[PDB]
Design a protein around this ligand. Structure first.
Ligand SMILES: Nc1ncnc2c1ncn2[C@@H]1O[C@H](COP(=O)(O)OP(=O)(O)OP(=O)(O)O)[C@@H](O)[C@H]1O
Ligand SMILES: [Mg+2]
Ligand SMILES: [Mg+2]
Lengths: 250, 238, 219, 145, 232, 240, 234, 240, 192
């Protein structure tokens, strides 16, 4: 019995533990997602992968999931574990609401899920979860918020982040061009369009190959909208014409 | 040799090796002898100490007023088995209100020690119990082993360098059938002195004695009252 | 037609071959398997048939093949690379025995210590006909072995061989020999004139060669 | 990637495979071949046109074991009644080459004890003296493909 | 007794799960199958072949009804199919007990996929070796779905699985559209199954299932023979 | 073709196969015996051979036929102990079905339950998948005779003529050649064909003391074993 | 290349226990002496940096009013054994209403040393045996008693013991300076002389600690006030 | 290699290797024979004396299972005693549940199933004892069964286990045991054990004989001392 | 025995021939062999195991044959075999024949030491690193009479090695090596 074991919990002579490292190498491929916020409303942009000619296009959502009245999250990596994790945190939020009769703050929910995710890396002898995902939300404590998770277990707040295969270039371009406390929910969309244009190899940015979700605040609604395909095309062509004009200036 | 790391693996010759290694382990302890007459059972043990400033290790244990044991091996498992024996004998005394016959007790020990030699990741017990008792049929001497295989014998000796004692006991077997305790103990001591080098023999600090009889409770003698028994022995011939 | 003898190493096989060669009158050829492996293709089979052809001429000759497991290894199928030259000399050996024309005049003996290796077509009843097997000596034989090899040494009359044989079980023949030379030298260190019982008792612990640890805390 | 000194054989094989069914045709020449295990023969040599018929020669049915026992037992100066059917019933999966050995062992058992004739008990000892020695021979049967 | 309690599926140095890939390779060697939907219902076609005339072709079935309006076909290993069928039946039963309504197709697909995924992370087990096609008709719009040993799932208009699935998908690319009827769908399904079929196609080597807003059922051999005739 | 522990336990090899199960199929052949089953117009016959190599052994307790139920019969091949255990499980399952549902169990449900039980062994990596086969015969209302077969991999099916054992291939070939003629089947014809199949596959011309025959028919659905005398009667009637 | 936690050696040895036995040669040395006047215990500290607080680390800790213990080897896992001894003595006092003997405590704590296991048990202790060596001193009804325990679970009564890295040299020197008619003062002086002789760093009043127990008073631990008096007259 | 370490791995040719190793462990036991008469059975065991220290009657290898059932074992003593205990408990359980003495055809089957349960999983090892069960009843005659460690049990007219099993059965078959009453069988059993195990192999040994049948009114017990004395006195005449 | 071959003959004892030296690395086997080679007066033929691997089939056996022939040419002298564990472990052939020719070389080496008039007046001496892989037929006495084992120095060995290795340097007059010995429990001479 000890001959067939794989020992998926022990350390290594060099200090690190291999399984979480291999999972992070696995999350490298398979998708591209990013999130940005600077004022009322926060936006998530995702790169659709299944773009074959024969898809029925149901469920009104591809990679964006709703977790509460004011919580949404994307995901990258193996999709089945994504289904598991989303279902797992949904009832966490609901049981908090049942006990306290108050919407759950984002930070506590993220910490709870991260604790569950880390439990598998210390004891049990099971394969870890190969999924990393973002969180966007709003609450009365700190307004609007964005956070990022990790198969290792840790997390952290952010202002603009990317997770997909070309995350390095996206992060460099983001830190090169951003302003603190001025970007309204009109310039952030253009910034995301330009970043996606740079990262993906396919030019002309076919509107069916991207997905955009935005969160905005109302008197008592906190409406989440998934803007349709009838509004992406003019945004893209506006980006194209302004880029052509700027290049022609030089 | 991959046929050496578990008690579940069978060798191509049909010999499990962990049991053989436990039988090897039991030979590292000090020697001990046991024998029986018509109406008594006597066992003798030779002690050992590490440094001259340490007390000698105790080898004879008291199980019950009509049952005594002598150990050889490692002490922890010996204590565990001795505790189990105490418990079983007391339970029998409580329920049926009668002493437990030696044979049934030995059978219980045999059935208990056999269990670990079949599961996964379990080791046998390393002990060399010699059991001396008195019952309705008279005296009784028994010997066990780590392989859960008990033997019924009328004279035995085990431990390190036990072969010479066995030779002496075998060639003087008949004389045990008539003599009383006074020279029976002398015969046991003569047998035990055979398994030592030619420098030191018996000084009252390395020898213990245990007697059970028809009308005598299980009694232990050590280091002070052994002198009456130790005197009267001729010097070792050269 | 012929005899094989097999069993664990250190039992008296090659000793029997030497004895038989010492008693008989016939021509005796002595050979060992690995000696037939040769570099140039076809050079080994020539040696095989030339040895049988020599023995045929010396009318009553007998032939002894030691270390047979160096040739008889089981054939196999392979598609990249494999071994074939030795297989091809074996297929000549398997044909000087039995084969297309019977030879009835030469006696074949062969010896090995492992049999699970050998090719079944070699073990066939027509070629190797009696398959003798050699067991490890039981208690009474060890006394006799020790009592033979100490025939020429000066030893005192107080030795009890049926004690020594009794505390040395799971030895084979070679070790029961070696006890006697160890017990000689142990006595020689102290300048003593003849061997005594304790010198044998120490020789036992020499030949056991068990690793050391104190284990004094036992008992 | 076999070694050199192991492509020469593969030229000799090309000569053989070309002499039969080459560019020029045989007449009135016939070829017979025997092998112990035809797993390993080159697929070009087993082609219909070079080796046309394949004849399986197999371990005997009990009727054949009786036939072979009656062949090899005859010349012995046997004595009293003999019941070959018991022998045929015990010997199972024997080669033809083992029944000859049974007949030799039977006489070997009677050279001891100074007899000059054989009786059925000797056959019944020898059958088992042989039958248990087959345990250390591998049991595989190989077949061309 | 007890099990092992350690995962047999682990991550490779290149960030890939090997066992899932091997299970997919085993799936790729199964019997071919095709599935189509066109504006009125769904058609599932699969090919069956007994080794000799001794086998009874009417004793076992490939297409199996979970409930009155859900159908399911498979490609891959044989024995593993029945376990999944039985589990799906149970799940539909608990759903109907709780809600007093027939289960929607999407919920059943999600639950079955969850089971199949959970079966690749627990200890001392190996993943299933089949790929499933599920069809249904609820609230007018027909639905078609495909599962995966890894647990993922997709929604399709037309799908081919099994041997030579790439050729089937390319063939469906140049033929299928969004406006046909069940009869023409049957015709094109048989036509595309004829690409890798045997020499002669008989009315018993093929199993066909149809779902419309009247319910799931399995075509009897008579009308299968009728459809095979007057075509090809 | 192999990488890791795929040769020692039941996990997929790189090509998509697993060997710990297809080793059991060749473990079946260790017994060296063959059994045949034939289905007729209104009856079903099971025939097998038996070998008693020694006189000391009691020949009355070497049967491979077993009475699973008063209406359902079976025959086994392969390792003996595993076959006995499967017989025990089948008996218990049939009795439980009768207790629970209040009417007799169909043969196909029984075969399916047995196969589902056997499929677990090739799913977990701590058990060994029981190298023994299974053939059942029975009578069902509105269906007539039924003959089903089950294997260690969990694959059950329903046949018209079956053979299990060493000589499976050529016996199936002979049965196919006979059945392609499409002639009428009665009791005597079915028994004669079943016996002659084994007789010509093995080429023995045996005696009425070396085979066993079981039969079921729609006149007394009780499973019954033919006595040696009537077996000899069929044997002599076969030889004109 | 992997073997189970319980596995016997070709020569009669256990593998884990032998390793634990040889793993106590990395700890500090400690000396215990028994005399009819009382029991003396002494040990070093091995301070590493000037920023140590020498009062934080301690080796001698009292089990009860009349039983003291000195530990050597690893220190992380001796706390469980110490706590077990405390609780067991209190339970015996609660049930029988008396003070239990030293030997009883030793044999009650030694039963737990060899219960490590990997199969057919609750978590317990997964594998490692304990890796500490303990010296027990006390004064019971038959006078002053000293006992020494061993990671294999073997306890025996001694008259003068030294355990740790410098065990064999200290024992060899100790064999020739002992008799059965000592007083407490000369015992303390001899222990101090030995520790000064073997210790690496220079000896002072903060590098060591000492305890004595007598039939009259209870377990008493010396302080940095009377410790330099016995040093200055060395 | 490595296919022969667990009890859950089929070798490439399709057979289990640990059970074969248990067999080879059995073949070094001493010897034990048992033959049935017109109205009972007789067991016989030759027991070797290792050294003079041991007492007569030590470690009996002829066990008494139930009030009318007897057992004779060969192999490793510890496993044999465990099997005897489990069979004894099972028989008592049966008597308590139903209400009469258990027949052999059921007790032997249950013990065989329990033994076979230890050859599938990798967490336990196969047993190493081969044993014989014997009994006599007024309504069923004499019964003899033999069970091996692989989990197989057959019925016999006479059987032998140990080293020289085949040599013993050679002279077993010469007897016409089908006729005589087992009062004169004791002499021939003694004769047949004194004609094996040459004195070169070992110096001394002793004979253990059991008895059950209608002669004892159903009880099973050791033979009287005088009868065994006469039996061995007769058997010594083989020196001619 | 070579220096004084008169005590043994008078006493009738035939001395052992072979010897083996085994232990963990960096312990003193090769250095002890060098000391022996320096002291002696007969031959001293040194052989490294890895030299017996050859490109063609049937080569290593030849070199073994000529080695023992040249050895027999002299009157009496010694062979040294270093790193045996590279020349033969055990016979295990399975599947495709692998590690097979080296086994033939090992068999020839075994044959040359025993059977049909052994080498006579030739004494061998082999030393190895991991002796758990050696073949059982080779370790039989009559070829490897002695089995000297080299273990890690206990305490006196460490002080003695320190004294030997530091007696030729300029050092302070009052350093104590016993403490240094106590500070390194399990270590070899190389680390000292
Ligand atoms: N007992 C010793 N006395 C003196 N020097 C020693 C001793 N043991 C080891 N050394 C020194 O340590 C080194 C040991 O190397 P050596 O060649 O003797 O090792 P080896 O046993 O051949 O090792 P390996 O098998 O790893 O090659 C040398 O530098 C030697 O001087
Ligand atoms: Mg030889
Ligand atoms: Mg070196």
């Amino acid at each position: 019995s000890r001959r067939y074991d794989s020992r998926t919990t022990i350390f290594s002579p060099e200090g690190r533990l291999y399984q979480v490292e291999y999972a992070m190498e696995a999350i490298g491929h398979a998708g591209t997602c990013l999130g940005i916020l600077a004022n009322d409303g926060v936006l998530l942009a995702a790169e659709r992968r299944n773009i074959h000619k024969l898809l029925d296009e149901v469920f009104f959502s591809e990679k964006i999931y709703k977790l509460n009245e004011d919580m949404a999250c994307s995901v990258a990596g193996i999709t089945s574990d994504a289904n598991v994790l989303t279902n797992e945190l949904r009832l966490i939020a609901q049981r908090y609401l049942l006990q306290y009769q108050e919407p759950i703050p984002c930070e506590q929910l993220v910490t709870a899920l991260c604790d569950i995710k880390q439990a598998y890396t210390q004891f049990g002898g099971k394969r870890p979860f190969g999924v990393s995902l973002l969180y966007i939300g709003w609450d009365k404590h700190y307004g609007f918020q964005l956070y990022q998770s990790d198969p290792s277990g840790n997390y952290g707040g952010w202002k603009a982040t990317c997770i997909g295969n070309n995350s390095a270039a996206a992060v460099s371009m983001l830190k090169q061009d951003y302003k603190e406390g001025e970007m309204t929910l009109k310039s952030a969309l253009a910034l995301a369009i330009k970043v996606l244009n740079k990262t993906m190899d396919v030019s002309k940015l076919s509107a069916e190959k991207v997905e955009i979700a935005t969160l905005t605040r109302e008197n008592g609604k906190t409406v989440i909208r998934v803007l349709k395909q009838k509004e992406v095309e003019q945004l893209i062509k506006k980006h194209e014409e302004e880029e052509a004009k700027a290049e022609r200036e030089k | 040799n991959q046929y050496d790391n578990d008690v579940t693996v069978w060798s191509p010759q049909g010999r499990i090796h962990q049991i053989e290694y436990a039988m090897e382990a039991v030979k590292q302890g000090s020697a001990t002898v046991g024998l029986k007459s018509k109406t008594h059972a006597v066992l003798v043990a030779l002690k050992r100490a590490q440094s001259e400033l340490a007390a000698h290790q105790k080898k004879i244990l008291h199980v019950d007023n009509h049952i005594g044991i002598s150990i050889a091996g490692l002490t922890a498992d010996a204590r565990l088995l001795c505790n189990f024996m105490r418990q079983e004998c007391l339970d029998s005394r409580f329920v049926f209100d009668r002493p437990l016959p030696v044979s049934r007790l030995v059978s219980l020990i045999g059935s208990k020690t056999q269990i670990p030699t079949q599961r996964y990741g379990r080791r046998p017990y390393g002990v060399g119990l010699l059991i001396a008792g008195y019952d309705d049929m008279g005296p009784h001497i028994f010997q066990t082993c780590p392989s859960a295989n008990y033997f019924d014998c009328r004279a035995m000796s085990i431990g390190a360098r036990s072969q010479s004692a066995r030779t002496y006991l075998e060639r003087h077997m008949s004389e045990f059938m008539e003599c009383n305790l006074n020279e029976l103990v002398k015969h046991g001591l003569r047998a035990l002195r055979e398994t030592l080098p030619a420098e030191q023999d018996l000084t009252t600090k390395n020898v213990s004695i245990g007697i059970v009889g028809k009308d005598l409770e299980f009694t232990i003698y050590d280091d002070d009252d052994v002198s009456p028994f130790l005197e009267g022995l001729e010097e070792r011939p050269q | 037609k012929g005899v094989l003898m097999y069993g664990p190493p250190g039992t008296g096989k090659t000793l029997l071959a030497r004895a038989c060669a010492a008693q008989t009158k016939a021509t005796f050829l002595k050979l060992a398997g690995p000696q037939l492996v040769q570099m140039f293709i076809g050079d080994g089979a020539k040696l095989v048939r030339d040895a049988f052809a020599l023995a045929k001429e010396k009318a009553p000759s007998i032939i002894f093949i030691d270390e047979l497991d160096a040739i008889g290894t089981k054939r196999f199928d392979s598609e990249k690379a494999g071994d074939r030259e030795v297989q091809r000399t074996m297929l000549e050996l398997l044909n000087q025995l039995d084969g297309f024309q019977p030879n009835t005049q030469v006696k074949v003996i062969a010896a090995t210590n492992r049999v699970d290796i050998l090719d079944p077509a070699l073990l066939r009843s027509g070629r190797l006909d009696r398959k003798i097997e050699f067991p490890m000596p039981n208690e009474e034989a060890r006394a006799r072995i020790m009592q033979i090899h100490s025939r020429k040494m000066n030893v005192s009359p107080d030795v009890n061989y049926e004690e020594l044989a009794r505390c040395t079980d799971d030895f084979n023949g070679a070790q029961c020999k070696a006890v006697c030379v160890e017990a000689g030298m142990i006595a020689l260190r102290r300048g003593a004139t003849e061997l005594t019982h304790e010198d044998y008792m120490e020789g036992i612990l020499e030949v056991q060669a068990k690793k050391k640890a104190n284990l004094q805390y036992y008992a | 990637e076999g070694t050199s000194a192991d492509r020469e054989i593969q030229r000799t094989l090309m000569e053989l495979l070309n002499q039969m069914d080459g560019f020029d045709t045989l007449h009135r020449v016939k070829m017979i071949m025997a092998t112990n295990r035809p797993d390993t023969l080159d697929p070009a040599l087993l082609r219909p046109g070079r080796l046309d018929r394949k004849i399986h020669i197999d371990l005997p049915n009990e009727q054949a074991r009786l036939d072979i026992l009656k062949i090899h037992a005859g010349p012995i100066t046997k004595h009293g009644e003999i019941d070959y059917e018991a022998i045929v019933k015990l010997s199972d999966g024997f080669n033809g080459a083992d029944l000859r050995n049974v007949c030799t062992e039977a006489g070997m058992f009677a050279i001891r004890a100074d007899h000059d004739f054989v009786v059925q008990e000797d056959f019944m000892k020898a059958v088992r003296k042989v039958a248990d020695s087959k345990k250390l021979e591998s049991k595989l049967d190989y077949k061309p493909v | 007794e007890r099990g092992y309690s350690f995962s047999l599926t682990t991550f490779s140095p290149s960030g890939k799960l090997v066992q899932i890939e091997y299970a997919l390779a085993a799936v790729a060697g199964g019997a071919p199958s095709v599935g189509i939907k066109a504006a009125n219902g769904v058609v599932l076609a699969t090919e069956k072949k007994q080794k000799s005339i001794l086998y009874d072709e009417r004793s076992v079935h490939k297409v199996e009804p979970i409930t009155k309006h859900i159908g399911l076909v498979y490609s891959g290993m044989g024995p593993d199919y029945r376990v999944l069928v039985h589990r799906a039946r149970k799940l539909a039963q608990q759903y109907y007990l709780v809600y007093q309504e027939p289960i929607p197709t999407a919920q059943l697909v999600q639950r079955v996929a969850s089971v199949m995924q959970e079966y690749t992370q627990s200890g001392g087990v190996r993943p299933f070796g089949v790929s499933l096609l599920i069809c249904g008709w609820n609230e007018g719009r027909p639905y078609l779905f495909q599962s995966d040993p890894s647990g993922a799932y997709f929604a399709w208009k037309a799908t081919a699985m099994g041997k030579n699935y790439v050729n089937g998908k390319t063939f469906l690319e140049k033929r299928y559209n969004e406006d046909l009827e069940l009869e023409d769908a049957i015709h094109t399904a048989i036509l595309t199954l004829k690409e890798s079929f045997e020499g002669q196609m008989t009315e018993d080597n093929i199993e066909v299932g149809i779902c419309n807003e009247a319910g799931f059922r399995r075509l009897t051999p008579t009308e299968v023979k009728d459809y095979l005739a007057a075509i090809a | 073709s192999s990488a890791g522990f795929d040769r020692h336990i039941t996990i997929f090899s790189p090509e998509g196969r697993l060997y710990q199960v297809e080793y059991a199929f060749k473990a079946i052949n260790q017994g060296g015996l063959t059994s045949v089953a034939v289905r007729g117009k209104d009856c079903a016959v099971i025939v097998t051979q038996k070998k008693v190599p020694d006189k000391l052994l009691d020949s009355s307790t070497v049967t491979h036929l077993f009475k699973i139920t008063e209406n359902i019969g079976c025959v086994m091949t392969g390792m003996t102990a595993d076959s006995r255990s499967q017989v025990q499980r089948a008996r218990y399952e049939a009795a439980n079905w009768k207790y629970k549902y209040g009417y007799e169990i169909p043969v196909d449900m029984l075969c399916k339950r047995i196969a589902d039980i056997s499929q677990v062994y090739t799913q977990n990596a701590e058990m060994r998948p029981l190298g023994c086969c299974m053939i059942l015969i029975g009578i069902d209302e509105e269906q007539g005779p039924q003959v089903y077969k089950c294997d260690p991999a969990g694959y059950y099916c329903g046949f018209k003529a079956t053979a299990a054992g060493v000589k499976q291939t050529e016996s199936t070939s002979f049965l196919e050649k006979k059945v392609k003629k499409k002639f009428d089947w009665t009791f005597e014809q079915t028994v004669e064909t079943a016996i002659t199949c084994l007789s010509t596959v093995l080429s023995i011309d045996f005696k009425p003391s070396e085979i066993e025959v079981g039969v079921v028919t729609v006149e007394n659905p009780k499973f019954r074993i033919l006595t040696e005398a009537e077996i000899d009667a069929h044997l002599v009637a076969l030889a004109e | 290349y992997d073997r189970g936690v319980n596995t016997f050696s070709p020569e009669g040895r256990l593998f884990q226990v032998e390793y634990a036995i040889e793993a106590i040669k990395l700890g500090s040395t400690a000396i215990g002496i028994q005399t009819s006047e009382g029991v003396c215990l002494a040990v070093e500290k091995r301070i590493t940096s000037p920023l140590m607080e020498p009062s934080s680390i301690e080796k001698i800790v009292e089990i009860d009013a009349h039983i003291g213990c000195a530990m050597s080897g690893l220190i992380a896992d001796a706390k469980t054994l110490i706590d077990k001894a405390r609780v067991e003595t209190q339970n015996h006092w609660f049930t029988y209403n008396e003070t239990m003997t030293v030997e009883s405590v030793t044999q009650a704590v030694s039963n737990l040393a060899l219960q490590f296991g990997e199969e057919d048990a609750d978590p317990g202790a997964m594998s490692r045996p304990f890796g500490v060596a303990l010296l027990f001193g006390g004064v019971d009804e038959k006078g002053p008693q000293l006992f020494h325990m061993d990671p294999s679970g073997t306890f025996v009564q001694c008259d003068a013991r030294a355990i740790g890295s410098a065990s064999e040299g200290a024992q060899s020197s100790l064999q020739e300076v002992y008799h059965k008619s000592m007083t407490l003062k000369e015992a303390i002086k001899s222990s101090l002389i030995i520790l000064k002789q073997v210790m690496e760093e220079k000896l002072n009043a903060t590098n060591i600690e000492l305890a004595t127990v007598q039939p009259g008073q209870n377990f008493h631990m010396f302080t940095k006030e009377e410790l330099e008096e016995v040093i200055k007259d060395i | 290699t490595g296919y022969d370490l667990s009890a859950s791995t089929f070798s490439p040719d399709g057979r289990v290797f640990q059970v074969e190793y248990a067999m080879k462990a059995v073949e070094n036991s001493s010897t034990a024979i048992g033959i049935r008469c017109k109205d009972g059975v007789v067991f016989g065991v030759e027991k070797l004396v290792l050294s003079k220290l041991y007492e007569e009657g030590s470690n009996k290898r002829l066990f008494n299972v139930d009030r009318h059932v007897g057992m004779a074992v060969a192999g490793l003593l510890a496993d044999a005693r465990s099997l005897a205990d489990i069979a004894r408990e099972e028989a008592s359980n049966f008597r308590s549940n139903f209400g009469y003495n258990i027949p052999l055809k059921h007790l032997a089957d249950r013990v065989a199933m329990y033994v076979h349960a230890y050859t599938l999983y990798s967490a336990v090892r196969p047993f190493g004892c081969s044993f014989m069960l014997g009994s006599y009843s007024v309504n069923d005659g004499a019964q003899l069964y033999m069970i091996d460690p692989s989990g197989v049990s057959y019925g016999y007219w006479g059987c032998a286990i140990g080293k020289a099993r085949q040599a013993a059965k050679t002279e077993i078959e010469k007897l016409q045991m089908k006729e005589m009453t087992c009062r004169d069988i004791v002499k021939e059993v003694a004769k047949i054990i004194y004609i094996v195990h040459d004195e070169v192999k070992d110096k001394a040994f002793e004979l253990e004989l059991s008895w059950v049948g209608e002669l004892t009114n159903g009880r099973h017990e050791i033979v009287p001392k005088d009868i065994r004395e006469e039996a061995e006195k007769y058997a010594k005449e083989s020196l001619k | 025995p070579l220096l004084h071959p008169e005590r043994f003959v008078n006493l009738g004892i035939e001395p052992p021939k072979g010897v083996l030296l085994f232990g963990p690395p960096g312990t003193g086997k090769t250095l002890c062999a060098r000391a022996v080679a320096n002291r002696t007066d007969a031959c001293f033929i040194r052989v490294i195991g890895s030299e017996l691997v050859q490109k063609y089939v049937g080569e290593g056996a030849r070199m073994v044959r000529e080695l023992f022939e040249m050895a027999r040419t002299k009157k009496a002298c010694l062979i040294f075999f270093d790193e045996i564990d590279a020349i033969g472990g055990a016979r295990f052939d399975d599947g495709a024949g692998g590690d097979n020719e080296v086994q033939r070389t090992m068999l020839e080496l075994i044959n040359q030491l025993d059977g049909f008039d052994p080498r006579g007046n030739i004494k061998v001496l082999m030393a190895t690193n991991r002796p758990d892989t050696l073949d059982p037929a080779l370790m039989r006495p009559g070829r490897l009479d002695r089995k000297i084992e080299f273990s890690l120095p206990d305490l006196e060995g460490r002080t003695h090695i320190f004294k030997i290795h530091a007696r030729s340097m300029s050092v302070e007059r009052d350093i104590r090596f016993e403490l240094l010995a106590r500070l390194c429990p399990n270590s070899t001479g190389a680390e000292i």
